[PDB]
Amino acid sequence: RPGRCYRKFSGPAYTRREYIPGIPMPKITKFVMGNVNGDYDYELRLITTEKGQIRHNALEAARVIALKYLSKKLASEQNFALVVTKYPHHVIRENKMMAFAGADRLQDGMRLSFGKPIGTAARLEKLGELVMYVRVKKEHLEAAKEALKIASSKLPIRTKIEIS
Amino acid sequence: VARSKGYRSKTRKLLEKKVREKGAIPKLSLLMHDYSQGEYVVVKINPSIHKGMPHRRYHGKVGLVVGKRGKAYEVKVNIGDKERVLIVRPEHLIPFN
């Protein structure tokens, strides 16, 4: 299903697991990469621009692409560390019934059209919220710029970078 | 989905009490003072006391002491353009102003 289907907000959040049975397992499993507690100098972060919800599926892909670019750069345990901030707390639900029941004269249409859990999203509620960030030294900010930027290529929403 | 018209329906925090005043009835000082006709009172339901609990529909309002029956009082309150009488024990009444 296309990413344009869940970009905006359709109703409130969706969080209580005990109230919402059967959540598909999110793609993301690891959230921290690199030698945390390692010595770093440049302190660049990532900032979003407009509101919305981001599917975990893209994020996990964004997680992988960032790692390989850095991994080939120097190493995976070297003087760098990647940490993604948000978590897919939000859950999306879709009326899939038009697929199976939508061809057998069952209760089709908007009949009983409550959504069904198929994916999760990391919710964004503040203008300019952190999504991920990376810590390096003085000598590798240039590689870090596009490293975030290439990840941002896959994000659904417009993003912003900074240097610190 | 129509909601049940339970006598305490939709009260998840209406009858919630701030933790600082839990337990049995503390404010004995309010009760001991006695009302007479023509007095003006404010209804503030105590969720703890199960006796003479007025319905939620008239909570936090202005009441008038019109008489006394038994240990309890009866109170006149205007809600719409009608009149109503609420017979209640005093332990949800606080003087106005």
């Binding site: - | 933790v19 600082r20 337990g23 503390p26 004995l28 000082s29 240990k71 024990r89």
Partner: protein, 193 residues
């Protein structure tokens, strides 16, 4: 106190003074309190009434005046002392203007023939109108016949029970056997004033 969740019971409850549930009933029923509290050295009786800034005691009496204004000679925290002060309370109460009230007890176990019931009877006999269950004290306890009977065994413990008090060494001749006789004379003394 361990955080915002921790609740604090009242000062009296923290100090174990009064049972509010009992006090609760008097408030809702506007009961006028009769309070025969006891301490290790004397007896305390009061007639209370509720008010905004706190309780108001209409009349009050203490064991101390019995040895000061009425010349009591025996103990100040026993049954005869308990009865005497209760009888005093009513006389103050009667001239006070009150007619009826309710005994307020709290932390005294309702034992029949105990000091507490001994106190209330005196106020009753003083003329104070207070309905009471009929399982109160025993008549012989008021005059302390048991005490003198207990005292009469002084032939056994090589001494009288009334080991002389803080000042009874050479000032107060405690007379344990002649106890009830000393009761009436003070009772006669207090009956007319």
């Amino acid at each position: 106190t361990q955080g915002p969740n921790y609740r604090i019971k009242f000062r009296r409850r923290r100090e174990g003074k009064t049972d509010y549930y009992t006090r609760y009933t008097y408030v809702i029923n506007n009961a006028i309190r009769f309070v025969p509290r006891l301490t290790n050295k004397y007896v305390i009786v009061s007639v209370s009434k509720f008010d905004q800034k706190g309780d108001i005691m209409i009349a009050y009496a203490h064991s101390i005046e019995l040895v000061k204004k009425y010349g009591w000679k025996g103990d100040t925290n026993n049954t005869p002392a308990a009865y005497l002060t209760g009888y005093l309370a009513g006389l103050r109460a009667v001239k006070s203007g009150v007619k009826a009230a309710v005994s307020d007890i709290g932390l005294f176990v309702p034992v029949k023939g105990g000091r507490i019931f001994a106190v209330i009877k005196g106020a009753i006999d003083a003329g104070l109108k207070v309905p009471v269950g009929d399982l109160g004290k025993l008549k012989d306890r008021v005059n302390g016949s048991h005490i003198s009977a207990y005292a009469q065994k002084l032939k056994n413990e090589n001494q009288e029970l009334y080991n002389k008090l803080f000042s009874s060494y050479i000032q107060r001749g405690l007379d344990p056997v002649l106890l009830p006789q000393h009761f009436e004379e003070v009772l006669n003394k207090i009956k007319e004033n």
